[PDB]
């Protein structure tokens, strides 16, 4: 401890090592947007090309969910049976579980159920990929001269880049905006009835004609003597051109007229699938959509992945301009850049304070040395503890500035005081001083960890955000305290100019001397007064109860939130076209919006990316989505040039005057959950009453909740209802006499209207698919059921019109399940005056009042709240009792801690007030803001009572006498740190621009904390301490005692 | 699993046992394998050897 | 682990038919449960025994 004050060089060495280890361990420290906070997600996606909804639900999904048993730390399993042939099963795992162990466990349980799968799937792969629950980044590509089609650009993507983007050590599924090329054979049904051939014949044709073949070797092994040859037997090779595919032979006519493929059908290199149309400002574009990583940091996933893309960028052709719609990157750089700004500001500010009080340059250098060294290495505590420097962690640093600045100030100050009163040379004056506050600083360390370690113990995703803070600010504390024990004191016995007893400046030299007199006269007023207050016990007690009680009202009347919403420079708006609408209508809308934003928001919007085909959880024709990138924040001044107002008037325009649901919105800040107080209610069918009963129970319920505006808000189902589906019921009999084989009839209907994956070919040196689907006009209106004939066993064709019964029922375009059984998702929010759990008990009562076989469950954000809920108070019970007995040890008593801990209402009711004043809210930034506030309030309070009791005892002085003296000499510092600080948080409190939601939420809560904290504590504490103490035995007196 | 008075047969019960539960006990994070005492329904078609001859 | 299976079961329990009742043949649980309540008993007895001796 002290050992260093007469060892500046050993002290320096601990200091220098810490700086170098810190800053140099800074140069290679990871940088992200936020650290991976969210419970890890895996997706199994599969493609059943052309299937129906109840098909991919009942053939692939239900066949996995029986054998998708045996994965470790699994929390829940959700699945979507798209009527696009896609099934998507996302398994969400227990937070902090081994990600990869989970994901791999999943794929070796894919193969217990895999052989007994459909064969159209088994042949079309299934991809299991560890994934976020949202897109991390999207890089767009467009063509300059526009002379490329979606499908062309898309091919290029697939030809030079998208092989490793799913291989970066942090990427699950990438949704490619486009499609890689496939050999597209478009069957003409007339020109097929013409030549006595049907689809079936086209298939077996192209299968057989297009392959590699089991070769062999000339001079094969084992040869015989003399042999002098080994050379490669090549065989038939799969095809390559458009020529090879037109010239495909199907049957030879008796006259010699060969019947080729080119005759019967159209042949072009086409898109492998035409679900989605993606328009970047209308101009055709293909992009890559990257889902965030199960655990990676941002500028580095981006450094390695942009390593990929910048590795493919020098070799791109002209006519092709790379474009940039949405990342989470420049955002981060300017944000942290902002936090470095504020920290730096805080040094120049403190030194401002420090000079304007201590007026000795050489005293102003001292704490200036303090903070760099403690931060620089504070980083080291992180980097070695495996965390990363993103947004929020840095907010733990700038937020820690308070207890750091206090540390240095408290110490250097007391040196100044002892030398101002006794004339001692520095070195000795320091020894006596450090001797005045030592125990105090170990105590502060204790109690601080007492308030801050329990935050790391939060559970869940919330647990993770809190952890980032615990660790940063606790670490900032640890290094600051050790500094305050080795270099900080050792700098004093080494750097400060010696002051003779009692000069105190007063008047000596204007600007300042006028200042010091002003201060002294003031402070004595302060003391003459404080004692004045000590004469009156009762009054101030009452007033206290008040203040707490007020703090209580004020806390209650502030509604929770989870994190602030940010102009992220980027947002999205959603589209939903009425049931059964077609691509034509949806694309009409996307065109409408794209025009709107790019016109009547001429100053702000730079780019819209309209995605036609998927909006809600799955893909589908009725659905559209548009991604808006904006111009730099700097060029969108006011409030109306912000996400708030833009989204507002967009949705104004699109909500109330359209035939399609058009909502504009922005996601919360974090790439994951917590859209405030709400839910994701799952009504699971349990008895087995099939899709209909579930549909109606959910409707009954959805109307049942619209009937309580005094508990719920926006009770909406999220998903798709039951759309018109068209049964072609086959009368097997009529076909069983007639000499036609059913197998062929099916596979024909299929390859006609769905399509068929048949073989693979080699374009330009890279493999692609072989697809034979009907042509355009021969499968769009019900009437085409007729135009297709199947060739029977005899040799004559047959109408579908001979056996095709045809009717109209309903089916859902999305058959969903939750936890292995069929279910339905009612998404929601709590009414403006509600906690979510309130809604939770009431929903529990509504879904209780539903038929026996409709059960209920919670997922996602609303999964969190089933775990514990009312325990944050319990961790504060822990934080509390521990900070207390830590005080019962520093003060070797029980009552004296009551005296110091009673200061916390004072710090908060002021912290509450300001957040309440502006428009702010009880979130994280305010919660951490609060704790840090709790801390300085309690620190300062600690010094007051420790110096007084020291006098009382070991200087034998009296209660009133000493508390007044202590209060007297250690006042001036309270105000210094306070004033240095309040001014530091100040700008953040203001701030417009990037993270101003953050800056404001923290800064404001904290500052309001600071005012009331000091101007209340410096008057309250002595009343705590004397009046807390005014309950014990001996004379005391006030003034006694007599000793040494 | 049992029925109190009037019995249902092994397979009846068994079906219920296997059809609504053995889906989640074996997917619960913390379970090895389950061995079901009985067996789940399957479509039982029993061929007639005379009537097929 | 029983709490997790019984989580499953407390959720499959409302949707049941008549006569259909859960029973328990092989339970290595009550042995453990009453065993610890018992080692606790002796432990505390050891304390009361001790304090009395002293
Ligand atoms: C941001 C700007 C605004 C900041 C607001 C700060 C206000 C905080 C309140 C502090 C008030 C201190 O006031 C001081 O103490 C006590 C009571 O207070 C009074 O003093 C009197 O009270 C008692 C009552 O018997 C005694 O008789 C005492 O001898 C007498 O001095 C005041 O005349 C004054 O000496």
UniProtKB/TrEMBL annotation, chain B:
It comes from the Bacteria. It is found in: Cell inner membrane. Belongs to the resistance-nodulation-cell division (RND) (TC 2.A.6) family. This is Efflux pump membrane transporter. It comes from Escherichia coli. The chain holds residues 142 to 194 of 1049 of the full protein.
